[PDB]
Amino acid sequence: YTRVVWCAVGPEEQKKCQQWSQQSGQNVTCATASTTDDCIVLVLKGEADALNLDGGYIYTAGKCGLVPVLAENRKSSKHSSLDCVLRPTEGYLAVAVVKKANEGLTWNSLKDKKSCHTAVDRTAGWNIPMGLIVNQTGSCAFDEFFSQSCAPGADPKSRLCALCAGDDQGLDKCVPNSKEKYYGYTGAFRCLAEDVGDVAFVKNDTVWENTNGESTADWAKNLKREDFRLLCLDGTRKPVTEAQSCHLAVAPNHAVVSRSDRAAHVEQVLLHQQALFGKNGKNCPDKFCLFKSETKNLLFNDNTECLAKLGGRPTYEEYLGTEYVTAIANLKKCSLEACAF
Ligand SMILES: *[C@@H]1O[C@H](CO)[C@@H](O[C@@H]2O[C@H](CO)[C@@H](O[C@@H]3O[C@H](CO)[C@@H](O[C@H]4O[C@H](CO)[C@@H](O[C@H]5O[C@H](CO)[C@@H](O[C@@H]6O[C@H](CO)[C@@H](O)[C@H](O)[C@@H]6O)[C@H](O)[C@@H]5O)[C@H](O)[C@@H]4O)[C@H](O)[C@@H]3O)[C@H](O)[C@H]2NC(C)=O)[C@H](O)[C@H]1NC(C)=O
Ligand SMILES: *[C@@H]1O[C@H](CO)[C@@H](O[C@@H]2O[C@H](CO)[C@@H](O[C@@H]3O[C@H](CO)[C@@H](O)[C@H](O)[C@@H]3O)[C@H](O)[C@H]2NC(C)=O)[C@H](O)[C@H]1NC(C)=O
Ligand SMILES: COc1ccc2c(c1)c(CC(=O)O)c(C)n2C(=O)c1ccc(Cl)cc1
Ligand SMILES: *[C@@H]1O[C@H](CO)[C@@H](O)[C@H](O)[C@H]1NC(C)=O
Ligand SMILES: [Fe+3]
Ligand SMILES: [Zn+2]
Ligand SMILES: [Zn+2]
């Protein structure tokens, strides 16, 4: 009676779900879809129960009447008086990153350059950057601003995927799941790292997690923090040590959403699943760890300490915040009252 069905996006998140499933006593089983939007639809239909989402998609899902249930929490200095689950989230910092070697590249000369985005409609990788740029340009022509990009989820032979690489066998070019090589936080940063783009729109954490031997991967093991700069909105450039005074915005933590008729039931099971497989669980890191996959962020971000209860029972609008939700509306009028599905 108590069983939850997770929705996995793409073949890699599937395999990871399958393990979680088997290690759970079929307390959690799996559904798989090729895109986040398709997983949202599975959940509305009632064939899946839940998944973890970037704030940009929480805005989609919430118009269709889905609700935040538990949020991700990463390591925190302040607020250490308290327990992670009852501990307040903070929100990550969205940044624009460049090679140090590229002098002359400022927030003011981004026109006609090459760009690396997490995916279309995501907070740090899309809504923040393109919102600012529509504003400063007064045009909805965000498809003509950069010469070429990789923006997973756009038309495959527009210039917005022009830089995307697809899977081993060259298939799936710019699909929005991890088969695409430059998908998500890690892929967008790899995109700038390998000098395919001139800038990448990721979050502060991503730079740290993938420089200075912090990530054991082939493309990144020789990357070094001092080789990068952040672009600030006042036209200057700073070390990645200054993210606190040189970001584009702060962003709501990714959160697990479900259909509201299912929210209590999902919350109940997951809090128990993190007790077995979480950051200090009975069975992690012995048998299985929910918050770990090789710097991939599969199902969850790897820097997740825990899933946190929500303060005060949010609506998705309260959780996303008033500031970020007007940002999104203003952008969507470019490309008020109806589900996308
Ligand atoms: C932008 O994002 C970054 C990435 O998250 C973030 O920095 C983190 O800051 C948090 C809290 O402010 C900090 O918290 C700690 O938890 C750590 C676990 O993550 C504990 O540290 C130990 O474990 C980690 C992981 O294995 C080791 O990580 C390394 O990275 C750095 C540099 O590569 C080095 O660590 C340090 O060495 C200095 C020496 O002076 C020392 O002062 C520090 O305390 C630390 O030890 C190290 O070379 C490693 O390669 C590390 O070795 C430790 O053994 C720790 O107990 C503490 O509670 C977290 O570590 C930071 N993340 C990382 C990976 O650097 C920024 O805060 C974000 N900035 C903004 C503005 O939001
Ligand atoms: C790009 O520009 C648009 C258009 O201005 C930005 O939206 C505007 O920004 C501010 C900040 O949220 C909004 O004003 C605020 O509204 C509430 C009540 O209206 C008020 O109490 C707040 O203190 C604040 O004044 C304003 O409503 C909004 N304007 C419109 C027409 O919606 C948008 O945020 C920008 N996009 C990005 C990513 O910056
Ligand atoms: C009405 O009470 C709150 C409480 C928290 C808030 C906001 C409003 C708004 C803004 C708004 O929508 O106007 C934001 C952005 N909040 C946060 O980001 C935040 C982050 C971490 C924690 Cl632990 C708590 C809150
Ligand atoms: C599965 O769920 C049942 C109900 O709580 C519980 O008895 C059991 O401990 C759970 N097993 C695991 C491994 O989650
Ligand atoms: Fe995000
Ligand atoms: Zn700020
Ligand atoms: Zn409320």
Side-chain angles (χ1 to χ4, degrees), residues 14-80:
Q14 195 190 354
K15 177 170 160 85
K16 163 154 184 205
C17 190
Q18 266 153 210
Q19 308 188 59
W20 181 13
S21 177
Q22 157 176 10
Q23 286 299 298
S24 73
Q26 317 257 93
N27 282 348
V28 168
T29 49
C30 307
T32 313
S34 290
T35 69
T36 305
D37 295 323
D38 293 336
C39 267
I40 286 149
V41 170
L42 278 182
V43 165
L44 290 173
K45 281 200 291 189
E47 296 153 36
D49 294 298
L51 61 158
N52 192 32
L53 303 155
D54 173 86
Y57 299 121
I58 287 182
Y59 172 88
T60 299
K63 293 215 163 266
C64 294
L66 293 203
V67 298
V69 177
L70 286 163
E72 292 181 353
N73 238 339
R74 92 262 159 159
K75 316 282 199 81
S76 162
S77 208
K78 202 258 204 180
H79 279 101
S80 181

Side-chain angles (χ1 to χ4, degrees), residues 20-314:
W20 181 13
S21 177
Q22 157 176 10
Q23 286 299 298
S24 73
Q26 317 257 93
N27 282 348
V28 168
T29 49
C30 307
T32 313
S34 290
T35 69
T36 305
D37 295 323
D38 293 336
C39 267
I40 286 149
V41 170
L42 278 182
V43 165
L44 290 173
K45 281 200 291 189
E47 296 153 36
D49 294 298
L51 61 158
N52 192 32
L53 303 155
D54 173 86
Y57 299 121
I58 287 182
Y59 172 88
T60 299
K63 293 215 163 266
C64 294
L66 293 203
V67 298
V69 177
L70 286 163
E72 292 181 353
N73 238 339
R74 92 262 159 159
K75 316 282 199 81
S76 162
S77 208
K78 202 258 204 180
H79 279 101
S80 181
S81 324
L82 284 71
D83 194 297
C84 176
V85 167
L86 320 168
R87 147 135 52 80
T89 49
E90 271 170 294
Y92 52 96
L93 297 192
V95 287
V97 188
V98 303
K99 287 293 172 80
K100 183 177 122 202
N102 235 306
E103 356 181 338
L105 185 55
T106 67
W107 179 265
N108 299 341
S109 47
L110 271 193
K111 184 107 185 50
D112 280 17
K113 297 338 202 263
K114 297 176 259 134
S115 63
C116 305
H117 307 264
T118 56
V120 166
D121 269 353
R122 278 177 68 160
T123 296
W126 187 264
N127 297 346
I128 299 316
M130 304 293 100
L132 296 160
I133 283 170
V134 157
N135 272 3
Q136 291 161 1
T137 279
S139 149
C140 285
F142 62 70
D143 54 304
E144 297 184 16
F145 186 79
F146 290 114
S147 45
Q148 320 174 286
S149 321
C150 173
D155 184 351
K157 273 248 279 183
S158 79
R159 42 166 90 172
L160 289 173
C161 275
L163 297 178
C164 291
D167 74 357
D168 355 89
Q169 285 239 51
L171 301 179
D172 270 340
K173 169 184 318 293
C174 211
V175 286
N177 69 54
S178 59
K179 307 208 225 222
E180 163 63 50
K181 176 181 195 178
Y182 291 140
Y183 172 71
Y185 293 117
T186 304
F189 183 67
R190 182 196 196 152
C191 165
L192 160 90
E194 293 178 340
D195 279 311
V196 167
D198 290 308
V199 22
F201 299 103
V202 290
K203 60 166 166 188
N204 163 64
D205 304 80
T206 305
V207 171
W208 296 75
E209 281 173 24
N210 296 291
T211 56
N212 294 23
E214 222 42 69
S215 149
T216 87
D218 353 286
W219 62 270
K221 44 153 196 213
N222 274 325
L223 299 170
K224 162 194 304 135
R225 258 160 234 152
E226 232 302 296
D227 294 343
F228 295 97
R229 294 288 182 262
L230 306 171
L231 309 189
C232 321
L233 282 154
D234 61 0
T236 59
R237 275 153 74 98
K238 291 179 151 24
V240 311
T241 49
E242 307 303 295
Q244 192 72 238
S245 44
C246 177
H247 52 266
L248 310 187
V250 56
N253 293 352
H254 292 205
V256 166
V257 305
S258 73
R259 233 171 66 163
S260 42
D261 55 307
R262 294 290 290 157
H265 196 62
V266 179
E267 187 172 338
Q268 204 183 263
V269 169
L270 231 54
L271 279 175
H272 170 64
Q273 287 296 309
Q274 94 177 334
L276 323 191
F277 300 112
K279 168 136 209 284
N280 295 317
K282 255 59 177 176
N283 296 328
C284 172
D286 302 296
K287 308 195 75 210
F288 171 89
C289 300
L290 217 27
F291 305 139
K292 235 141 292 241
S293 82
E294 309 96 64
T295 10
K296 249 108 147 101
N297 308 313
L298 309 173
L299 308 179
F300 305 87
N301 289 306
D302 295 348
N303 61 358
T304 299
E305 218 192 302
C306 80
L307 310 172
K309 291 172 178 226
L310 291 183
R313 305 252 208 257

